[PDB]
Amino acid sequence: IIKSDINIKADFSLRNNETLVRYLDYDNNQLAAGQNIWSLKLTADYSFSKNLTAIFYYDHSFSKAVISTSFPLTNIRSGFTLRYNF
Amino acid sequence: IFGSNTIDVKPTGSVEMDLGVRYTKQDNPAFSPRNRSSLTFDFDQRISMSLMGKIGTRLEVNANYDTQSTFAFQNLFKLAYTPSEDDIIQKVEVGNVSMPLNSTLIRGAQSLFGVKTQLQFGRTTITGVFSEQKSQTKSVVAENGGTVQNFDLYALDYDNDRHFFLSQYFRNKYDVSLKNYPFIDSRVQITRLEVWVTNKQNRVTTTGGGNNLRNIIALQDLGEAQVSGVPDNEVVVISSTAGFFNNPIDSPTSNTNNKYDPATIGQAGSFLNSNIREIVTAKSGFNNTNVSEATDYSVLENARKLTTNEYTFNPQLGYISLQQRLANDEILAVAFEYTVGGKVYQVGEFGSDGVDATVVTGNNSSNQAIITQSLVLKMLKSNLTNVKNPVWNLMMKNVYQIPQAYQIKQDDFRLNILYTDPSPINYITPVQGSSFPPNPAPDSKVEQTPLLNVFNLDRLNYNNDPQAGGDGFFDYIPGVTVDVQNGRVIFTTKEPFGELIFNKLQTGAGESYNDPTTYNANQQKYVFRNMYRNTQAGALQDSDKNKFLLRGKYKSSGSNGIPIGAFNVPQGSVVVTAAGRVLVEGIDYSVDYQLGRVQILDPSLQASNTPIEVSLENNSIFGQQTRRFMGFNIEHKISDKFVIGGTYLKMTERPFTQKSTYGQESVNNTIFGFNGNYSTEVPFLTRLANKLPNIDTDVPSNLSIRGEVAFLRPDAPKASDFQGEATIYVDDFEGSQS
Amino acid sequence: SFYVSVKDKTIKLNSTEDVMREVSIFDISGKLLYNNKKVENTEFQVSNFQSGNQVLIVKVTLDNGNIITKKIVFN
Amino acid sequence: TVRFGALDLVRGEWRRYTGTLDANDQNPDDDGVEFDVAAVNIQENGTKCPVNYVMPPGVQREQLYNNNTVINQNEQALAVRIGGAGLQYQDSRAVFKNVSVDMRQYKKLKMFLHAESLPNQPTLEDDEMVGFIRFGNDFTQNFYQVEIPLKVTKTGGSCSISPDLVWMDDNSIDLALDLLTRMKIKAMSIDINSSKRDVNGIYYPDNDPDLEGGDGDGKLTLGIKGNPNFGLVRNLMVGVKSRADHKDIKGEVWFNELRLADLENKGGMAAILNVDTNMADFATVSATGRKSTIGFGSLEQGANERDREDVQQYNIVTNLNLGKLLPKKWGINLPFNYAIGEEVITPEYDPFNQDIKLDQLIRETTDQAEKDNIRTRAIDYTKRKSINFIGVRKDRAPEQKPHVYDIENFTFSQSYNQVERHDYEVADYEDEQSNSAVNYAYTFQPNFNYLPSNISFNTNILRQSNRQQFREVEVEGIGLDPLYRRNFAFNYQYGFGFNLTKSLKLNYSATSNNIVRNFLNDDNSPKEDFNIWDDYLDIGTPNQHAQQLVLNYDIPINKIPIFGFVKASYSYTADYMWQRSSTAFSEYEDPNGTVYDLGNT
Amino acid sequence: PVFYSSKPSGISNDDLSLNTTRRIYSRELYPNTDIAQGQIQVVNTLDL
Amino acid sequence: DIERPITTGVPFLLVAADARAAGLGDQGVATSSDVFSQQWNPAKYAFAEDAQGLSISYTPYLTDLANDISLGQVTYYNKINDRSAFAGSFRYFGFGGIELRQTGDPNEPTREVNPNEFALDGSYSLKLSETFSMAVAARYIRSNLKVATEEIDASAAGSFAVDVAGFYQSEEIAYSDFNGRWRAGFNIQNLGPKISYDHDDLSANFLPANLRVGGGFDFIFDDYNKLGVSLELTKLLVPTPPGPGTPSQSQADEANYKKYKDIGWVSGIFKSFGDAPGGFSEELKEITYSAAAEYMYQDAFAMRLGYYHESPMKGAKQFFSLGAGFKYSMIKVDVSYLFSASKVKNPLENTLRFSLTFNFGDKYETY
Amino acid sequence: TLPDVEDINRDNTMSTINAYYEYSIDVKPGMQVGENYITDIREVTNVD
């Protein structure tokens, strides 16, 4: 009874970073900083009515530790957002 | 009760609701296994509602709700009930209301939330309000555009741990070189300066001027020669100076002045060996015996080099100003190069001409030896504070940071020095039973002399040309007495409240500035030696000397229009006063309400220098007490040209607790008064105007008379009363002992 | 642009480019725990403050008059 | 196993006062006295063994909502412990705080005090240890001294002692600041070398045989040394003192709830009269008169923000369109503005001593010359005058061709401002400013072209004169020598734009700042009797001169039919500036006596 | 807190009753200090 | 001031979560049936005029200081018959996302925490007679305000509770000057096991068990103007902790607290009626009362005034409330404001509540 | 996760100075208030 088009938007990102300090006279390549974070933002839209709109979202990010001062971190945010316009 | 039965309040906007979960897992092994992951429900509302409409052509609704607005005042809700004109009740308002008053002594309030009702009994108008005041009254003073900011700094409140002489040579040259300012009696031109500090950030980055980390050894006595009027123990900390110096007495600071010269490390008779270059063997690097790890030298292993935006230096007077002060155990070490005409002197060791950071021998890690070498620098601040060492005297105590001031200008800056004991007096009087030194030099006058002259800050006229007794104004010299970019005032002597006043009060050669027991009882009262020989906290123990006050003002304009220090000022809350008279919001000035800009439009007032007072309501406030505003206004109308008023207002603050600490008081003030308004038209004045030579006007002449009397009855709320009496706690002792 | 960090019961304020004029730290009850009218820096460290009550609200008044609000957890 | 439920470094806002307080000892860092300052908590010291900590009678814990829950706040007292060898006879130990407190709007200063003996030490007896408040601008020269012998809470039995016995009403300080005012007024008649003064210079009215009534307080011993001011307290000190002669005493003393009471809430009044009139669009007059008394203020103003001065102010602003007095067939705009006003401010408190009301000090002086000096030095008087001729120009009649020599291309502005003041800081202050401006601008309307596109020129005469005579607060006999600041300047800048070619454009501009130094003698001494109008049309020596040239060229290389694709555009800007150096440079005298001209830049 | 909340294998209730191992609550050390509900109610003692 | 306050776990459950009841002095036990009738009296969902409804409510905290600190509520009801109704609600208190930035590096990956407390409950209301209905509600409570550190255990604490409520609504009875209608209700709330914030039975806090009783009367004029007056009485069903002493000095206090904390919640309900040395007059002091008035115009405009009074010895939360309501077609908008008359600062001072409810489905005739 | 280093103040350098103040506390069964820096003693009688 309800007809609507579903809009899918998926955004993936993988970012790598490394800071190295190199000694010229001997093998002392020191890893000073780094980042290995990847994220995925997936959204799905559905219009139940002209005023009512439902969106499903799923954000998943995982950051690897490159040096031990950083801790590996996983952040997942998923759910449904309901929007009603007046 | 309402005009009709229609109800057309139509909502506008949107509502958003977030329903979801939040998962987080941080792999910190120090965390408890019970804290391995966090799985929480996520909820969020993003209401952006708007409500407009009417109920029965008599009730009007104007509401706007947004959960992402500012603090509290952008969520407006206005209910307006306007009945017919024959009823006693003329208008009832609930919600965001205002109480505008056509009065000068008794100001109304624009940012109120409550109930406002208007009554009309034939020809008498009664307006009553009971509300909560969401705004705070703010007043600013402006002269010639920019807002005036007033400052008061006592002598002890100098800019500490930020400004450092590069050597004892510059410190001891400072006073004599500035004797005839703005002329500087010195040819010193600092060309290069490298500043190193203790590295606790420990971040490698290619954009902050590169990655220049070096091992550092900072020597307190590096580059120092003797000083004619200063004993050697006040110049260097070395236990014995025998065979230490190798240049004439008054030689300018340079590496080659003593046996700590990095260029001659361990050659034939140096005081340093090659061990000085290594952190591990730093102590063994000294040939002399009594050397301490934090007095004679200090070591840093990954010292970070400050970039040019983290400090400024005075090329002529040989001192530096750090952006961030070193109020802790940080080590400050410098290498600098300067020219005196054709001669070039260097005191530290630059990365360009210093020993290499790393030297490697061998072919592989099995037999490789790694020699990490340190740069030899001049210590300006030690790891461990010792006020008895000359490195302590390297810290300047004569620089004062004008609060909030960033772009000070001449003609936009005033400074005066007062002695407050207890009233502010701009001259110094001798102690009873004694007199100031007889027949002083004109530059050493103290008796009946303004303190600006006493502390060598007023010898020039407006154009910075010398004038006999000064011009009564602070000498504004961008290179000497002020730091324009940073808004700092620098005295022309290194110890203005110490040695300078001591010298001007000295009566004989038997009195020594370094021997307080020889003071002549005028120096006992006035010389604040402890603010220079001791830390500020230690100088707090000398409670009777912090009486000299640096007082003045500066104008902050920036752009066109008066900056009133508030944004989104409520409409109609701005009051502008020029010389006791209230200006007109359309003729004399204009207001840019969103940006908080007041533009004076009267041509005479702009070129006047008269102080303009601007009052306004500030609704961008937080952490304030609840403010109850209530009162009534009477607007009787005897005739079409004569109006009488009867306003009565009461404001009470609600304290957070029953203990009102000093400064954070609550008021329960009540104000009431009466006003009159007589505005007639006088055709006689127009007729007399038409009698003038070439006047043929017909516009009417009006006469307006306004009188008002107001009475204030202040009080404190009963909530903050102890045993029936209004009470303010100087110290309840709850805030001590953090 | 504005960052607040807490490492060990110490709060570090980092406002790049712009200069902070005043900082007020509130516990989440409306209670003021710390106030400094004389910050005047692009970086400020609240080392003379320690509560341990987890969630805090940092309100910073900039020289322009803009007010920046940040919620932090006092680790 | 040792378990730390807490482990902290504790910093206090109160600092132990090091150094001497009594001149008889002069040896602070000796005699083995253990002086401790700490705090006692209801949250940590409810089971303290000598005496349990309890709130003073009537004191309640503050209550707040944290998260829908009532949280009782901590209640704290400052605790001072005297141990080791114990206090000598006249020795004392104190802590201090740097503050900024105005207590002129309150009548009473109050504090709770408690005294107890140290465990395993000889019992402290009543009225042997004296708690004292010392406050003022310092602790050695300018301070009030409030002393109270302390009754000792009886210990030995149960550690739980009733709050009325922990905080005895007999040990409470209840000081009326009017007594401090009376003490200070009396001490005005005691010279610093009097035998009526202590060895420390403190004047104790209770110790004065020739004074009846003492300090007016039978419970407190009041002292004063050097004209302190409780209108601005910069130094607060509490501590303990000894009166046991042949004994060294030890004990613990608590201080709590130091507060101001009995707000002086008498108000004030103000009156404003406004007269506004206009004379047929030719003249407008606006007059305002304002009178306010001590105690008036705004609704939001607190105890220390409301008016502490009587204010009498009037201001008259008059505007005339003098151009209308001339025939309208040639349009002259001649607006005349005249503003005059003065303000008289009489302070509630005498500016000297800062904490005695002016009328009370005037009454209790007994010297006519001193009465007149006190009355006159307190008056804050300001007089303002403003005469303006801003915007004088001749309007164009509705049909003429513009001409380069037309007087309609000129604009004249004249502003005069004068401020006369005298108050507690300056016996005579006069500020005079005169600004004369003439503006000219003409836009021309339609080998290479040489006719300028437009011409601009304006001249400014700016003269600021400042006279400052700081007053002698002790006597109105001579006063300080007046200080003169003069800023006589002559400014002019001119600029003409060109359209030298259809593509080539030239703009020129030059500005010059001159300073007039006719008011200076042969030496660097200003002339006393120099009027601001003396030589008004005098151009001085150049001080700053700047020139700017702007060139815009489109490079018409497209004319030849081989380089028509090039779209070159050349811009050239040049700036020059000459700056006069200070006379300290241009007439520098080396110590050998030779005078050098260090030149300009 | 794992020793007190989710007892590991090999740990008994006797092991948690010693005055050297037991959980210390704030009300025991600070009976007069009010703590908001849902906040930290235990004293994390440093044990040597 | 507040003397011997009643200490309960999860005190956020007692906060009014809807603008309509807040504008009526935080009372809904005996008002007209509405979409928010779950926190106050689930039994009157069976008296709802609309078949089903969904509402969203926003109660911000510390508005001047910060944003996104609020109590949110979503309620849905659906009465399938003219005698029964199903309802579910979700109250949520949170501070919003908080960034745990440890270092000062802009690009360091930051953990975000959202300390929060929420309660999810579902109720079934059945209309026994034409004027009386009862309801039973089951609630799940989760508290997750703690943030994980090296020492702090941030495990969420949870508990369950049941509510028993009844609602009476008489028929429209005609009087001399009007034709009124009577309402009454009771609601025993938060009946469940103690919540252990630190996951230890030795340290458990009473659930905020609460008894609300109330009565309401509606003045009906001209069949289009309605004035509703309601009174509510509230009493916590948690025993009062001892104060001075009632058996050394601290030994007696410790023993008294030992006895008070070793009480079951079922037993605590009955110990609430008493556990004091005073009589009936001094135990009525623990009774919170609230009065309210509501004027309705065309059932699409409402003006709400209410007074709430706690005992000064317990909480001392007393205030006046103002509220307004607007119904366009199926959207009802409610706002409310609080004027505090108490010594202790009310955290909801200077705060505007917002409620938004959607009504849809069939219409049920009122009896 | 941090390596063990002989540098506790994290300034990259290892201090070898031993200039410090010393304070000591007796740990014995019969300690009372008024000596050994003891300012308060709280007795807990019946702990769960």
Ligand SMILES: CCCCCCCCCCC(CCCCCCCCCC)(CO[C@H]1O[C@@H](CO)[C@H](O[C@@H]2O[C@@H](CO)[C@H](O)[C@@H](O)[C@@H]2O)[C@@H](O)[C@@H]1O)CO[C@H]1O[C@@H](CO)[C@H](O[C@@H]2O[C@@H](CO)[C@H](O)[C@@H](O)[C@@H]2O)[C@@H](O)[C@H]1O
């Ligand atoms: C646990 C709660 C779950 C959430 C419930 C959402 C229900 C959504 C139904 C939409 C609705 C309710 C208004 C809700 C809006 C509030 C949103 C607030 C968001 C806050 C951030 C809007 O209907 C109204 O709104 C207008 C919107 O413009 C409609 O216009 C038009 O609207 C569109 C034609 O419908 C057009 O496409 C659009 O072109 C038009 O404009 C109108 O038709 C009408 O006035 C109508 O409800 C109706 O639809 C059916 C379909 O199944 C529902 O069936 C029920 O489902 C279960 C119950 O879910 C029950 O068990 C079940 O027995 C039953 O079969 C019923 O509900 C029914 O009555």
